């Protein structure tokens, strides 16, 4: 095929090749780990040369069913032979019912479809906020939305305006006004900002990802959930990296048996294949968008509903939640057990279900020598805020190579000890 | 059967009433009604859930310039699915730079950015705009100004509602975000004035204002405007999301004025209708100030989509459809004047470039509705922008003998709507 057929033409023989093709024609908005991936399958991926790895970032917990996963890829290529693409002007035979499918198997009456993460945040704050206005009866202009610091939700000029993360928003401004943020796993907090009748939603996380795998006490979620709807305001739910079996459960809310007022999902929702985002809600909260009042070119594209579909299926057929249950226990008690004490410059072994992270001490150590050595040993990292290393491998991952992968994954961070011994 | 498909089926949806009843209990309710449900696609046509033919007079508002389901396009999705999908830009891959060296150099740009959605190209810009202002110009703190023209449309985020001049866009979704200028569109004079600020950091454009009415601006607009920019350290940023890849009868409409856009936004047809990709391109001292951790996407740059743009953007080349829709679209503009002017006295205007083109209508004289009605008697599938603007937007892949045949049944309906008058 034509990507195929240029890429030969380009004679790019080596890694090196390939990484001065994206330092020239590739915007440099990322700092990527140094290798060139070719093929995924499963909870593995090859590079260029044949060298196998396994994925432990995930896509952020978007490949929770594994790279390629045949059914998902089966259920793409049946829909793209028939229908990619109507827009939501012309009405189709796949959209109402894969929302019908989500909304059963979420239980929510409604449910918006739009493409990415970010374009799920950006809708849940449109309607929380024409919500207050319209229901609530606040007055215009002024409904706040109250956020954690540490938040990631995406890279729109509102999430930007809303970060706490100096990379994040600086140099990005005028800011959109309208946020309130309160310290992340702080009940007292969040008391504190309900006062305001003005607030229409508190937007949160389950477990902050990209803030670090900051995980909140006990009852966290609970306590939120009951001092929002005590004042009349909405709880909006990312998860968006915790959803989908991640952490051991189907929504991480679960943990605390929150029922979200609204409901973002994205990531594996698509097994990772295409990019799918929803938002869900009750009726009376859903409803405020009318017709003409939101929209999105590819939102709710057929194949994308078909692959989301299949997806979904795949981890309750699959027992994903069950199987990150129990390997992610497993992990964490191995790591504390073999590196706490002998490793100084662990600060803390945390995490849910298979979303765990090391923290370490970036004074001790050079944390890029532990991802260095990690991929030494066969293993594909990226670590959040420099010093926060990072486990997410696809649920799928099997024992025998969840076994292995834990055993390369002690063995780095004890060379990387004896390195600076 | 896959999933979707053994769903489906157990919910026994027979008629068009069954799957527009199912639209109503689980879907978002943001579009208004829709008049089918389509199956299938293959090139210009679609068939309903009955089998009846019609041709697709909207194409996703120009993303679909290739056709449905266009056969390369679909294999080389195919081809990709089963290899990689999905790596993050966290680590490399051997399809993200070879893509994005390949639009580069057909589009002349230093650096391309690739992101899902029309509306994340349009935030990224506005970021990179401002960054660059902030950094490069030394304009003060939070000072930056973007113009923007009045009937512009750029997406649904809230800083694209905060732009926006139409109610239904921003209505009780603020507060907004600062920093926006709005003219006049096809105005020189007042660009001019606006450009005294010296706090602008760019002027935000559409060659042909799409869902503002295709809107043609008068000879040299896009010219006169980049000048002005040039005179004040200003960037000119295009949006080619509906109006480039051919669709107009040049590569990109901005061609017409042999304007290189300073930054370039592609979309829609960029991936052929299959997946949600889009691009923000420019030179390297504007696009280089996304330093690493700047900026991201889950799904931005992914492989699957990547693979998929560049057999689409193939395709365009073969087959020669700038060519194509020059030649037909100057064929469709002189068949309705030359039929509908004079002998239908609620035509205010037939207008486009290339295969963008409307009909508007006095909405005080005629019931828009009933010309959408007639147009899908007689197998025309279109949706108007801002109600009395039709829209006849087809792809470019139409065959001699289809447009032609649609072209008859296009002047037929318009006729038999006067002849109902
Ligand atoms: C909780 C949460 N919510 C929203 C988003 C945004 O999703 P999109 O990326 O689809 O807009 C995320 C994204 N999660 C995530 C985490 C780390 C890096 C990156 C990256 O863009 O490189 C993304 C996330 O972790
Ligand atoms: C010129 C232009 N720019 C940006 C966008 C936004 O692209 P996304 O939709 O991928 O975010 C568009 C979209 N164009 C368009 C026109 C009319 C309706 C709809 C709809 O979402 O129903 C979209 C557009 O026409």
């Given at each position: ?74 259920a793409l290529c049946r829909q793209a032979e028939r229908l990619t693409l109507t827009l939501r002007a012309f009405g ?64 729109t000029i509102t999430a930007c305006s809303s970060s706490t993360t100096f990379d994040c928003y600086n140099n990005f ?123 999105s070119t590819f939102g709710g594209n057929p194949l994308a509903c078909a692959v989301a579909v299949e997806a979904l ?109």
């Amino acid at each position: 095929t034509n990507i195929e057929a240029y890429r030969d033409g380009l004679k790019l023989k080596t890694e090196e090749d390939f990484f001065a093709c994206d330092r020239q024609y590739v915007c440099q908005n990322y700092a990527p780990v140094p290798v060139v991936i070719s093929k995924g399958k499963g909870a593995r991926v090859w590079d260029i040369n044949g060298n196998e790895y396994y994925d432990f970032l995930a896509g952020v917990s978007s490949l929770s069913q594994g790279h390629c996963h045949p059914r998902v890829i089966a259920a793409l290529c049946r829909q793209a032979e028939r229908l990619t693409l109507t827009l939501r002007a012309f009405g189709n035979d796949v959209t109402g019912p894969a929302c019908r499918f989500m909304a059963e198997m979420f239980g929510y009456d409604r449910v918006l479809l739009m493409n990415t993460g970010a374009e799920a945040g950006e809708s849940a704050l449109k309607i929380a906020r024409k919500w207050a206005y319209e229901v609530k009866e606040i007055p215009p202009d002024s409904a706040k939305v109250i956020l954690c610091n540490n938040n990631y939700w995406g890279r729109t000029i509102t999430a930007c305006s809303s970060s706490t993360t100096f990379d994040c928003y600086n140099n990005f401004g005028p800011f959109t006004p309208g946020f309130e943020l309160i310290d992340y796993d702080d009940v007292g907090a969040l008391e504190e900002a309900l006062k305001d009748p003005n607030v229409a939603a508190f937007f949160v996380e389950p477990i902050q990802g990209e803030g670090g795998v900051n995980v909140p006490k006990p009852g966290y979620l609970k306590r939120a959930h009951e001092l929002c709807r005590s004042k009349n305001v909405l709880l909006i739910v990312d998860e968006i990296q915790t959803g989908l079996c991640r952490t051991g459960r189907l929504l991480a809310a679960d943990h605390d048996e929150v029922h979200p007022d609204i409901l973002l999902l994205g990531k594996s929702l698509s097994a990772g294949v295409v990019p799918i985002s929803a938002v869900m809600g009750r009726a009376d909260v859903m409803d405020v968008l009318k017709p003409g009042t939101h929209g999105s070119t590819f939102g709710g594209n057929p194949l994308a509903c078909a692959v989301a579909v299949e997806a979904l299926t795949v981890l309750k057929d699959e027992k994903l939640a069950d199987r990150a249950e129990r390997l992610g226990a497993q992990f964490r008690d191995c790591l504390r057990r073999e590196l706490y004490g002998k490793v100084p410059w662990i600060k803390e072994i945390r995490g849910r279900g298979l979303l765990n992270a090391v923290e370490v001490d970036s004074d001790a150590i050079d944390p890029n020598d532990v991802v260095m050595k990690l991929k030494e040993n066969g293993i594909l990292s990226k670590p959040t805020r420099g010093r926060v290393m990072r486990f997410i491998p696809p649920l799928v991952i099997t024992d025998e190579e969840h076994r292995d992968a834990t055993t390369r994954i002690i063995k780095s961070f004890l060379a990387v000890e004896e390195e600076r011994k």
